[PDB]
């Protein structure tokens, strides 16, 4: 039943209540984040692309906030800021072009170090201005007295702050009515339950407020609701990673937040992918992981909780677990699932899936007849007789499954294992109640015993 619960991991909307707060769906959160109804295309303009310019100020006549002690961006800030911009243009129909000299720009970057009174400010972090035609519109500012701001490449909060402020400069607002300086807001003030770093980088609250746990890390890229929100304003970018993309270990994304170079690296991201056959490669971790390929769902990767999610409108096809005891849940597409070492639970779901339990005592689960129809049957390519198991207990709801040796009686709800000596393939047939013909089939590359089947 671990599959059942995991499938409902972090359910939202549908009149639910989480943490005593109203639960919002991705779109409701996205609408809330774009409530200011402002973008670089104007007010109340949705689904329209934009070609924007950005500039690293070398000097200023004044900072629109009144803050003083201007300091230009250093090399590392410049590189990290470009990565943040890229994480936004990757998902929304936006293009960023740098301008220098006297040319004006839609989005600007600059640091400050003192307040209007001329006193050192080592307490604040950063802020930005919404798009518009007013003086300073789209400008973003950061406190140079903060080490995370000076070293955004080594201090994760810095990079996250860049992405956050750029979010404002693009038209995104905090999930709720609250802002630094104004009193002392908290998650208790959140308009909806999903107002945390787990769903939006535009939030003020840690992922822990929603049950997630990134072990002190900060994802520096747009999360699931941020993606929906930014696309609501500028449209989705359908040209991003349209080939076969691999996320996690052995990544070919050339994106730091989608890449893990070794087991000690933390992964925190919401994936946007516009095409191809893709893979969630989390093979380098030894932690027990829970991987869900359903769009909009969250996964527990590398020892963290709720650190990985799939954006709405995205189809990820494959997943590879680690040496831990994992749970891999596929989607309606044809998935290739690899559990790796450890005792894993694989659930292909709808579609013709190919499953590899890997080393260990693995379990291949089937929740219904639609999971492996004859017209699009599953393949279990490395089944180990007497070690792995095939769970068909879900069929009990319509009558306890009975085993038959070489013939079906017709009473339905019977399971048969057929050995193909010539090809060394075992065909698992299931004649379901209500079905006039045998419509369930799982082909197995290897031998299987009646005692390997759970009914
Ligand atoms: Ca892809
Ligand atoms: Ca895909
Ligand atoms: Ca495993
Ligand atoms: Ca599937
Ligand atoms: Ca395994
Ligand atoms: Ca196995
Ligand atoms: Ca299937
Ligand atoms: Zn903010």
Curated annotation (Swiss-Prot):
Instruction: Name the Gene Ontology biological process terms.
Output: proteolysis
The entry lists its GO molecular-function terms as: calcium ion binding; metalloendopeptidase activity; zinc ion binding
Q: Which UniProt keywords apply?
A: Calcium, Hydrolase, Metal-binding, Metalloprotease, Protease, Repeat, Secreted, Zinc, Zymogen
In its keyword annotation, does this UniProt entry include Hydrolase?
Answer: yes
Q: Give the principal location in a single coarse category.
A: secreted
Known catalytic reactions: Preferential cleavage of bonds with hydrophobic residues in P1'
Full protein name: Serralysin C
Which residues are Zn(2+)-binding?
164, 168, 204
- The entry marks the following residues as binding Ca(2+) 5, namely 340, 342, 344, 357, 359, 362
Where do the annotations place Ca(2+) 6 binding? 349, 351, 353, 371, 378
Family that this chain belongs to: Belongs to the peptidase M10B family.
Q: Which Gene3D superfamilies match?
A: Collagenase (Catalytic Domain) (3.40.390.10), Serralysin-like metalloprotease, C-terminal (2.150.10.10)
Question: Which sections of the protein are Hemolysin-type calcium-binding repeats?
Answer: 320-337, 338-355, 356-373
* Cofactor(s) needed: Ca(2+); Zn(2+)
- Say if the entry is tagged with keyword Zinc: yes
Pfam families named among the record's database cross-references: HemolysinCabind, Peptidase_M10, Peptidase_M10_C
Binding of Ca(2+) 3 occurs at 322, 324, 326, 339, 341, 344
Q: Which InterPro entries match?
A: Hemolysin-typ_Ca-bd_CS, Hemolysn_Ca-bd, MetalloPept_cat_dom_sf, Pept_M10_metallopeptidase, Pept_M10B, Peptidase_M10B_C, Peptidase_Metallo, Serralysin-like
Query: For Ca(2+) 1, which residues are the binding ones?
Result: 241, 243, 273, 275, 278
Q: What is known of its domains?
A: The Gly-rich repeats may be important in the extracellular secretion of this metalloprotease.
Residues annotated for Ca(2+) 7 binding in this entry: 358, 360, 362, 388
């Amino acid at each position: 039943n671990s599959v059942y619960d995991f499938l409902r991991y972090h359910d939202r909307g549908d009149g639910l209540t989480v943490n005593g707060k109203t639960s919002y769906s991705i779109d409701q959160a996205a609408a809330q984040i774009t409530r200011e109804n402002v973008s670089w295309n104007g007010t109340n303009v949705f689904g329209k692309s934009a070609n924007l310019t950005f500039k690293f100020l070398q000097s200023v006549s004044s900072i629109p906030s009144g803050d003083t002690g201007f300091v230009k961006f250093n090399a590392e800030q410049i590189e990290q800021a470009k990565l943040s911009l890229q994480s936004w243009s990757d998902v929304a129909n936006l293009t960023f072009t740098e301008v220098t000299g006297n040319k004006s720009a839609n989005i600007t970057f600059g640091n400050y170090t003192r307040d209007a009174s001329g006193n050192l400010d080592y307490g604040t972090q950063a802020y930005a201005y919404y798009p518009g035609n007013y003086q300073g519109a789209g400008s973003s500012w950061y406190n140079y007295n903060q080490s995370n701001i000076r070293n955004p490449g080594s201090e994760e909060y810095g990079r996250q702050t860049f992405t956050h402020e750029i979010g404002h400069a693009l038209g995104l607002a905090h999930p709720g009515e609250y802002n630094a300086g104004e009193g002392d807001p908290s998650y208790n003030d959140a308009v909806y339950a999903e107002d945390s770093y787990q769903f939006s980088i535009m939030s003020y609250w840690g992922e822990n407020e929603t049950g997630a746990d990134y072990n002190g890390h900060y994802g520096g890229a747009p999360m699931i609701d941020d993606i929906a929100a930014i696309q609501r304003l500028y449209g989705a970018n359908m040209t991003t990673r349209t080939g076969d993309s691999v996320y996690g270990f052995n990544s070919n994304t050339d994106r730091d937040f989608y890449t893990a170079t070794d087991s000690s690296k933390a992964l925190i991201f919401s994936v946007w992918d516009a095409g191809g056959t893709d893979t969630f490669d989390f093979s380098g971790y030894s932690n027990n992981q829970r991987i869900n390929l359903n769009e909009g769902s969250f996964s527990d990767v590398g020892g963290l909780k709720g650190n990985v999610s799939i954006a709405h409108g995205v189809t990820i096809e494959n997943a590879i677990g680690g040496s831990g005891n994992d749970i891999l849940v596929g989607n309606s597409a044809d998935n290739i699932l690899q559990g790796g070492a450890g005792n894993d639970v694989l659930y292909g779901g709808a579609g013709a899936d190919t499953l590899y339990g890997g080393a260990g005592r693995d379990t291949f689960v089937y929740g219904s007849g639609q999971d492996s129809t004859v017209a699009a049957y599953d393949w279990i390519a490395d089944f180990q007789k007497g070690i792995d198991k095939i769970d068909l207990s879900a069929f009990r709801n319509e009558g306890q499954l009975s085993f038959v040796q070489d013939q079906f009686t017709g009473k339905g709800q019977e399971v048969m294992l057929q050995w193909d000596a010539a090809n060394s393939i075992t065909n698992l047939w299931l004649h379901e109640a209500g079905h006039s013909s045998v419509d369930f089939l799982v082909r197995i590359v290897g031998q299987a015993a009646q005692s390997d089947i759970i009914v």
